[PDB]
Design a protein around this ligand. Structure first.
Ligand SMILES: OC[C@H]1O[C@H](OC[C@@H]2O[C@H](O[C@]3(CO)O[C@H](CO)[C@H](O)[C@@H]3O)[C@H](O)[C@@H](O)[C@@H]2O)[C@@H](O)[C@H](O)[C@@H]1O
Length: 718
């Protein structure tokens, strides 16, 4: 077929990937769909137990990259050559045999959830768990899926499709409705006030940002608005669905969060208002009580999580427990909550603490069946009450939840932005890129909030710009960098969102740019008519396998050199108006240096960077109109994702004309191999500059497109 087991070996296009597959491991190419290009894998065991480890075979001398849970809530990256290097809790694994790429998807099957892990003998072990000592099983047929192909990202997509067609319990990213917040700049209260947020806090924040010319059009009222109590650092539990004191106008206390929602929308011009809540109500769940059938439960410890995060064994939540709402009443709980919120004008929720459900499998059906039931009810309640699909999933990097991700369309792709922890910044940019390789198959990644005023602001902000996801800050009011923010946000609060999850280049997939001391991390994305490439140095910090937390670690040179090729933007062909006849030549524009460079296909351009430095490049395919006349739009050169502005593009070779639809305002740049005769913006000739040495054509779009008539129409005549 292409992937087979014969002898005791796993073979993929005649390369031996695994040796010593034990005889009880069985393959099958049947879903109901039904023949299938890769292979499903499970095993038969002697006894009917609620857990199994089972070697799959022995990995040696094949580069792999993995996404593995280093906390319960979150994944990050790990590269190796050998089985022993594969961490506990590995949820996805990609393997390069050297040309050919292979993906391993441990899956949910019935009431069980797989992940991978390695042992010291270099075996890849599958780990099946029901997370409920009463749900037990002896055989498994479809608990890992393996599939190969020649394009690493296409390989991943095809494999997720195939898993989707087996399970029918989720939708791929591209098939879900994104909520409208992804198109606008936002503000999150969380880093501004933490749990001490108030409604006066909210207003001040929306005011200062609008003052500086970059207005948020959404806001996330983060953890802090809910009514909660300790029992009587002890844990808080939800006492009501309605807002605490800080969100009732100080005058008519019967008016609640409706007040701040109105202030934000009518007074400060926001389109969307989102609020935070745990999947379980609050951190300690809901106060035990017959209303929602709430009952104290204690997180069960699974071996792999505890192995990577030892501190989870003594977390507030583990030791003090949570009031878990009953599955029978969980819809009721979310509907009552969300109906209150929505009928107050709230458009969406940011749903945190999602992974706990896996630990509360209790006597309730297990990790998979309880995660399902809660997610089914959350969705129903979201589709009823926030029907722009206003769900942001946070702290949910388990396959329990990803494989029943049917509706929700936006996922935080890492652990939090930490303004005060200097260790975190490089790790953030790496965890976000690597997890988006796999998380972006399901939901649109969210690179999380950041500070415009921070030593690492431009580092974080460039990443946000090229992430594909919502762009927001969590600034405290008045502490803003609007020179910075205008590179991301147009006068009306819109952004230049790229189309895909921001991901590492083919080049970077198997080299760990946090740990190897040698490579720069290159992130790629696409717009309609350009690509875009971020280059970062994210070296010298990472999750330690020994210390089991984020540490700094030693780094040899200060400055690393890599290189950039147009083809590093993996899908750059899609931006060409004529892919059949395109030679591969790209206009590359260094957004930070201000320089335009023509890059023939093949040709490299070196890039040097110290730790925490970055460079963003817009990559536009060059169109050859006639011999000597070549063109490629850049977009808005003083914005990070400059190419996000070009909504339309057409070449008229017969008349020597480029016609463009450009959104936004500010300086517009293009590469032209000859000086233009004219540039025209809405039927009016305009002033432009040309640098004959580089090709750079430049003029000013002075104002936002007028109307109600969304784009500037620009003709360039050559
Ligand atoms: O609480 C609001 C915040 O929750 C989401 O997750 C934060 C999570 O909490 C843990 O971080 C710490 C540990 O003490 O708890 C608070 C956050 O409540 C601190 O900021 C600490 O860093 C945990 O270690 C984290 O891994 C976890 O992400 C977060 O996604 C949202 O930002 C939300 O505002």
């Amino acid at each position: 077929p292409a992937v087979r087991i014969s002898d005791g070996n796993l073979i993929i296009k005649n390369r031996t990937i695994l040796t010593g597959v034990p005889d009880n491991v069985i393959t099958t190419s049947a879903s109901e769909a039904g023949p299938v290009e890769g292979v499903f894998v499970g095993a038969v065991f002697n006894k009917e137990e609620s857990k199994h480890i089972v070697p799959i075979g022995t990995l040696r001398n094949s580069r792999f990259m993995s996404c593995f849970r280093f906390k319960l809530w979150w994944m990050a990256q790990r590269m190796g050559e050998m089985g022993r290097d594969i961490p506990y809790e590995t949820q996805f694994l990609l393997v390069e045999s050297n040309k050919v790429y292979t993906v391993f998807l441990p899956l949910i099957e019935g009431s069980f959830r797989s992940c991978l892990q390695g042992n010291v003998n270099d075996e890849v072990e599958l780990c099946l768990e029901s997370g409920d000592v009463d749900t037990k099983r002896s055989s498994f047929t479809h608990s890992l899926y393996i599939h190969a192909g020649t394009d690493p990202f296409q390989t991943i997509t095809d494999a997720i499709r195939t898993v989707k067609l087996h399970l029918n319990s989720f939708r791929q990213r591209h098939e879900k409705k994104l909520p409208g917040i992804v198109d606008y700049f936002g503000w999150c209260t969380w880093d501004a006030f933490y749990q001490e947020v108030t409604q006066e806090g909210v207003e001040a924040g929306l005011k200062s940002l609008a003052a500086g010319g970059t207005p948020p059009k959404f806001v996330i009222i983060d953890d802090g608005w809910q009514s909660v109590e300790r029992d009587a650092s002890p844990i808080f539990r939800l006492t009501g669905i309605k807002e605490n004191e800080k969100f009732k106008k100080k005058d008519d206390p019967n008016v609640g969060i409706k007040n701040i929602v109105k202030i934000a929308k009518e007074k400060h011009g926001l389109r969307y208002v989102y609020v935070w809540h745990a999947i379980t109500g609050y951190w300690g769940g809901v106060r035990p009580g017959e209303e929602y059938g709430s009952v104290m439960k204690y997180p069960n410890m699974s071996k792999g999580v505890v192995e990577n995060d030892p501190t989870w064994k003594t977390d507030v939540m583990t030791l003090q427990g949570l009031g878990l709402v009953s599955p029978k009443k969980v819809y009721k709980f979310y509907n009552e909550l969300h109906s209150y919120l929505a009928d107050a004008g709230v458009d969406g929720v940011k749903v945190a603490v999602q992974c706990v459900l896996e630990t509360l499998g209790g006597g309730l059906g297990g990790r998979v069946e309880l995660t399902r039931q809660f997610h089914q009810a959350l969705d129903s309640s979201v589709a009823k009450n926030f029907p722009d699909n206003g769900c942001i999933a946070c702290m949910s990097h388990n396959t329990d939840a990803l494989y029943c991700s049917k509706q929700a369309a936006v996922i935080r792709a890492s652990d939090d932005f930490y303004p005060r922890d200097p260790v975190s910044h490089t790790i953030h940019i790496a965890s976000v890129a690597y997890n988006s390789v796999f998380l972006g198959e399901f939901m649109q990644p969210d690179w999380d909030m950041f500070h415009s005023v921070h030593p690492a602001a431009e580092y974080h902000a460039s990443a946000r710009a090229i992430s594909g996801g919502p762009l927001y800050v969590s600034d405290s009011p008045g502490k803003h960098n609007f020179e910075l923010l205008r590179k991301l946000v147009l006068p009306d609060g819109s952004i230049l969102r790229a189309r895909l999850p921001g991901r590492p280049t083919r080049d970077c997939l198997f080299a760990d740019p946090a740990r190897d001391g040698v490579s720069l991390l290159k992130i790629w994305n696409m717009n309609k008519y350009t690509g875009v490439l971020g280059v970062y140095n994210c070296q010298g910090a990472a999750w330690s396998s020994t210390e089991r937390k984020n540490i700094f670690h030693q780094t040899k040179t200060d400055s690393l050199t890599g290189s950039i090729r147009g083809r590093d933007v993996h899908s750059i062909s899609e931006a060409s108006t004529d892919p059949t006849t395109w030679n591969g030549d790209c206009a590359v524009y260094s957004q930070s240096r201000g320089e335009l460079i023509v890059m023939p296909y093949n040709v490299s351009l070196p890039v040097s960077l110290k730790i925490r430095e970055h460079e963003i490049f817009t990559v536009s395919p060059i169109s050859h109109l006639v011999d000597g006349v070549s063109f490629a739009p850049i977009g808005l050169v003083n914005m990070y994702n400059s190419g996000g502005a070009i909504e339309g593009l057409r070449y008229e070779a017969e008349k020597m004309k480029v016609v463009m639809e450009v959104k936004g305002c500010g300086k517009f740049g293009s590469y032209s191999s000859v000086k233009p005769k004219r540039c025209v913006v809405e039927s009016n000739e305009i002033a432009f500059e040309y640098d004959s040495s580089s090709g750079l054509v430049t003029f000013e779009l002075d104002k936002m497109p007028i109307e109600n008539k969304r784009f500037h129409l620009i003709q360039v005549e050559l």
